[PDB]
Amino acid sequence: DLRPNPGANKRRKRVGRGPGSGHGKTATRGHKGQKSRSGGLKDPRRFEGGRSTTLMRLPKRGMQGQVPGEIKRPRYQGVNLKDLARFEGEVTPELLVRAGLLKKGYRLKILGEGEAKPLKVVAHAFSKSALEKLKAAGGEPVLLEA
Amino acid sequence: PRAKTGVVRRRKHKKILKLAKGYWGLRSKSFRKARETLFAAGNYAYAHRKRRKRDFRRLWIVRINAACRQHGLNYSTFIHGLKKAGIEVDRKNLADLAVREPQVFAELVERAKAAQG
Amino acid sequence: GLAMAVADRAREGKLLLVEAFAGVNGKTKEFLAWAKEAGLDGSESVLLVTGNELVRRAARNLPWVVTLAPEGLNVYDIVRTERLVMDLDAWEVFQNRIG
Amino acid sequence: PKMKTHKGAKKRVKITASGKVVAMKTGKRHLNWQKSGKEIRQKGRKFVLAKPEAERIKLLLPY
RNA sequence: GGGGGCCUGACUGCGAGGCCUGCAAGCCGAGCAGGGGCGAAAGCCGGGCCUAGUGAACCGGUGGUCCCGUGUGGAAGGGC
RNA sequence: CCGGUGAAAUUGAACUGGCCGUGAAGAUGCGGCCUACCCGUGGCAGGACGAAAAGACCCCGUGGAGCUUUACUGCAGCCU
RNA sequence: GGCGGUAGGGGAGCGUUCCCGAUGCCGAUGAAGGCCGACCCGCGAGGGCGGCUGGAGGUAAGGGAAGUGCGAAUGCCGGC
RNA sequence: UGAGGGCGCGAGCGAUAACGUCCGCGUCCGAGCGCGGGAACAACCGAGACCGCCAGCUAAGGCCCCCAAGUCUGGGCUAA
RNA sequence: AAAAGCUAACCGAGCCCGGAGAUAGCUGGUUCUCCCCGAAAUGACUUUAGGGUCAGCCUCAGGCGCUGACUGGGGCCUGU
RNA sequence: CUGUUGGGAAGCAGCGCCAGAGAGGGUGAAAGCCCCGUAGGCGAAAGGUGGGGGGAUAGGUGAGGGUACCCGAGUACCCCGUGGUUCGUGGAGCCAUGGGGGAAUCUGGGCGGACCACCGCCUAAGGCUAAGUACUCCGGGUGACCGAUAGCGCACCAGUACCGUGAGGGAAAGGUGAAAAGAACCCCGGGAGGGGAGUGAAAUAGAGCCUGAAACCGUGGGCUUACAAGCAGUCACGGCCCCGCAAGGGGUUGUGGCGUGCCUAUUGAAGCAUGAGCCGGCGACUCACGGUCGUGGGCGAGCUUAAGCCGUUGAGGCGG
RNA sequence: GGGGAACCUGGGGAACUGAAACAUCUCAGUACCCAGAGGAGAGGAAAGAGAAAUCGACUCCCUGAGUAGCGGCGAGCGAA
RNA sequence: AGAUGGUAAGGGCCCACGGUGGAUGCCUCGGCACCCGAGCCGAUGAAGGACGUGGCUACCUGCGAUAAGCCAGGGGGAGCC
Ligand SMILES: [Mg+2]
Ligand SMILES: [Mg+2]
Ligand SMILES: [Mg+2]
Ligand SMILES: [Mg+2]
Ligand SMILES: [Mg+2]
Ligand SMILES: [Mg+2]
Ligand SMILES: [Mg+2]
Ligand SMILES: [Mg+2]
Ligand SMILES: [Mg+2]
Ligand SMILES: [Mg+2]
Ligand SMILES: [Mg+2]
Ligand SMILES: [Mg+2]
Ligand SMILES: [Mg+2]
Ligand SMILES: [Mg+2]
Ligand SMILES: [Mg+2]
Ligand SMILES: [Mg+2]
Ligand SMILES: [Mg+2]
Ligand SMILES: [Mg+2]
Ligand SMILES: [Mg+2]
Prior knowledge:
The structure is cut from a larger assembly and holds chains A, B, C and D. By secondary structure, chain B is an all-alpha fold. In chain B, 64% of the residues lie in helices and 0% in strands. The longest helix of chain C has 10 residues, at 2-11. The interface between A and C is small, with 4 and 4 residues. Chain A binds eight RNA strands through residues 3-12, 15-24, 26-36, 38-39, 41-42, 44, 46-72, 83, 86, 99-101.
């Protein structure tokens, strides 16, 4: 293809809205008409009316914070073995991040659904009702400790 | 990339002048006056192009009425016979044969006094 | 996008890898005869790639031939020019990109 | 720039896993001088809503 | 509706399906388990013949709770 | 009246009659009817709801500002 | 079969300024702009054509970026 | 968008006044101040206007003149 | 020497520069063309009544396909 | 280089040349090769710089055992007010402290979010320290930045004229021609201003001298108007003058038909509700970041970078 | 010793505004006043961080991160 | 009896020709921003300014009682005040 004639496809050009005209868009600039319109209508999300919002809900969802804030206990993240059959061997968190899971959430636990290739998976924990689902396969050593 | 007005705003005011030709005083040289009286025209011309028939629709009848009453009968009594004769011809204009040879129309009259009396 | 355009000249044949040069040194005259003995008669435009800063000189003043280092194969200039030329010194990085 | 979440809504609401929004039920720490023991049950359980949840969704969004 | 007896179902854990209705609410409710009251049993009991007699949310007191509790162990505060 | 010099507010545009009705209902401007050669000049002020400073009047604004107080909170100062 | 239409919604287009298209092309045998016209294309906003003036820049087809299209705001500048 | 308005009707207020108001049904103006009758007359009557034509059928309403259409036929009525 | 008078021609708080493009639920303006559809002035809440959130009524795109308005027949509810 | 239009050639045609230089600007119009210059290369007696190299100097260079010496004072620490850290007294630490109480020398002293025990980090109350970082009066390069109402207020004798005592406010205004070659001279006339001749390619480029619109003023010509009631127009016919070929077309209007200016707010207009004397220009939904929906393209259990690092200078690649 | 367009450190330090009123809060230690340091300024060699019997002076960009947290827990504020 | 032109003081409509006025189009010793560089000056008197200075000089510019300027070195080579 030469330099010109490489136009776009279709359904993609901008032609944005130009509401300063005389029969295209209206002489009130689109979504305006009544009044109280030049700056803003406050935030139509959490507010407006001036009644009581809908913040009238109760926030029991506790442990809403202290002072030093969060605390460093490790995030246990699980992983469904459905695609653990994509590979095989002494699979370790070391590469499970390289595959496309965990992502330094760290502390890998295995669980899930499906046939498991008797592939000996080393991790930090295993779901019981899946561990016998592994017991009919191979071997599963545990993490270091805590 | 600035894009001043320039050509655009003038040429338009020249077109309104172009249609405001012969309009009294400021109504043809002052722009936003010429804009106005053009609004009424296109409206005045609209309605009247709907009206020009009713004008002639009326005129024809009087001439017709002028003719029938020169035989001795009214327009109301004239038309019925023609209609009784079932003659979807008479375009109320084409009944202008009162100075376009009359016997052609004078003997349309007697073909009316038939089917009614 | 780098690949697509290269085959576009291959798909039309408008391609050439080179390696031999009567103009391995600096002279615009020491090139246009090379083009004569290769097939570029000033009819249509050309992009050129080489890792030698001498040949560039030998054509940096060529209106229908724009310089290009082996790296920034800008798809602009590729599609810009109506024909393409490149070298192995390119066809190892273009390969190390994809190949 | 960089929209600020609404911690006054985080502490109150939890975003589901089908996009729905669910809050604890209202009316359980004031009116309880003995009224319907029935009521102290369908108010200790979470409930979902309708239109206004999208008014809430947009108050979160990075979370 | 007027009397007498025995009782505490003015229970707990749920709760299908629905009236009204913009939201929040408000309102009725069969069915099951734990345990109990009455009645010989069928059965009834999740307040009063009903429709009014009430207050989102924020903040804080009191009693329990396998909870969280900052390097760790108690503690302080928080959470249900 | 003649010679010389020569502004202003106002102004959408005008070829600007009266009367009796209509009409958000005070019509040169709509309907009907009557009157009226074109154009000035001197003057009078009934109309053009006349020019408004955004009426000197009343009301509104979760406006302003001055003043008052055993309205609220703070401060100087004063006692302690 | 439908096509009156305000707020409002969707779709489609015309014009201006600039960039790729360009070391390209049109331009002294006259460009942009300004006076015309009863010619032609388009329903359109617009694009071409003949004449006059002017005297040096202007840029197609397809893409891109906008300080982008005026009839009013007792809008502002200037002129009358 | 959340000020509506008119008319017919069923109520309340009002004086079985208000071209006054608050409701319900429906209609129309607003958005149909675009056409025809109502002299004039936004919502009373007819009738939804995409454009053109010097073509025909009609509704309301009208047929002596402005004003298009019977001084139409028969039968009564009234002398203001 | 007291009117709230005067403080550089308008003093219930001087003038200038700045915060500064303060704020304004208020007024007014909001610019080119053509096609299709096409409303609302209702209800609830609101220091709420010119404003604002939700439902209602509108437009567009996708997934549904006789259900939809209206009528006829059968049943039921109604207490002017 | 020549030839040919052209007042003028860089244009057009032919024949060539350079190229590490074909980026630009100027020359009577559009030049790679007429001019300055660009590619590339050389360069200062003097001042400065120094950030790269080198010399010198400042400074610095061992361990084991014992000793019972010293390790930064109203300081540490505690309380009463307080500020900073996201900490609005909150469970409220830590850092600094205005007031008050007031230590110790490694058998010591602070900290790890009240407090205590252990465990771990630190050794305060003396000071100094380049680099990496912000800015643009200045210089350079660059621009999908403007082009005389724009761009800062000033392209120009502008922070001027002008206003105000004063701080302070603060404009308007560019364009002959390539060359002044700028009108000798004659005539009207007091001059100004004009006629002619002349220069000039052009004076219809005349010194507010490129283009010259619109409002506004006037002269000439075609149509009309002194029995007529008017948002000033529309429709029809005739009439007058003009263009044109049949036929048709332009401009005007006498008569007849109808005809309640525009915008805005209003339920509501023709309106006695807002606004505009007119004209011409400036003037009003863009941008940044995050996010919901839609769509176009890339990959697809994956998808993707940010700061930054190498390189021509309108090239990209790494960077997980 | 004074000047220097902005940049930098310290001493003081608002209110409009937001909260659709408004006092805690925000705007913000911003704008403004003062003193001073130069081509940069400030900071700068742990009585540090923070959980590993680990990092190692200080500044600067990215991410962490609108996380943890702060809040008439309301607007909204905002680390390491 | 009747019918009918017929004059324009002036106006309106239009075409032509100009006057003011300056938009639009073209040009730019001007500014706007980005990146780099560079970054202080003064008691040896600074930044800024007053007055003067020329053969004649009104303003600008430069300069300073030696005054549109002095001295030495370096660049350059036909004009200059
Ligand atoms: Mg636009
Ligand atoms: Mg519309
Ligand atoms: Mg407003
Ligand atoms: Mg609300
Ligand atoms: Mg499992
Ligand atoms: Mg007819
Ligand atoms: Mg006849
Ligand atoms: Mg009058
Ligand atoms: Mg008061
Ligand atoms: Mg242009
Ligand atoms: Mg009528
Ligand atoms: Mg139809
Ligand atoms: Mg008749
Ligand atoms: Mg006073
Ligand atoms: Mg010739
Ligand atoms: Mg200017
Ligand atoms: Mg000005
Ligand atoms: Mg204008
Ligand atoms: Mg300097």
